Amino acid sequence: MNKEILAVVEAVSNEKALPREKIFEALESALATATKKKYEQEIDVRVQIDRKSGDFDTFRRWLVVDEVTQPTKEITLEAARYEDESLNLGDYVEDQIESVTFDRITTQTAKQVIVQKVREAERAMVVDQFREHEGEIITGVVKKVNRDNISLDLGNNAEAVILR
């Protein structure tokens, strides 16, 4: 259960590209995408798994907007009387508690989101490797040209773009 998730976050190789905080926010996103599959109601669900202390506890986001379609995520600009919300924007609820726990498709979603997150961390790494020269002349070969922008390479998988 939660001890398994703790073992996973202890066993992640890129603890430096993705420390505990990014790991449990990635699991937030993973459980959200999993709840997208648990219920046919497409609802954004933060779950604040509280990595260090304990395990997940499911919430429900109100997505404040005057519309009413998918009412699990519909609140008008001022519907904040009940539950002492008293907030126009950002007031979100905790209605459904302890939803479907980890199953195999939940692990599939977690796996894909954590691997794309490792990819995003490597993108931050190449950002750092291309930075420190912001505002300097640099050499670069191009890869593709488009009507709105062009792609450029420098070496070491250094990817950049030049807009129109």
Partner: protein
């Protein structure tokens, strides 16, 4: 990889999983009308040559891969019925499920 009968079926409604037990085989006495899953035979398809991160990840998350393969038997379109007897036979060495 081998073939499994894990009842965790992806991309399927809960109404279709209602007849299934914890193992993946419907109980003895639950009637079926249309094409409804009664064997949870979902198995991986994803090829080898995955990066070390992929292998370590799928290992630390249990034993999960491109398992989305339905590969499940349903009733033929047109025939109803009520299951009254289940028969399962394992190969020597394969672990016996709880229903067997």
């Amino acid at each position: 990889g081998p073939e499994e009968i894990t009842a965790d079926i992806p991309n399927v409604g809960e109404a279709a999983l209602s007849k299934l037990d914890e193992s993946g085989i419907v109980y003895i006495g639950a009637e079926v009308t249309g094409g409804d899953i009664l064997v949870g035979k979902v198995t991986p398809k994803g090829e080898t040559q995955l990066t070390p991160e992929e292998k370590l990840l799928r290992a630390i998350f249990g034993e999960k891969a491109s398992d989305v393969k339905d590969s499940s038997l349903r009733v033929p379109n047109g025939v109803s019925g009520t299951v009254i007897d289940v028969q399962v036979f394992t190969r020597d060495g394969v672990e016996k499920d709880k229903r067997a």
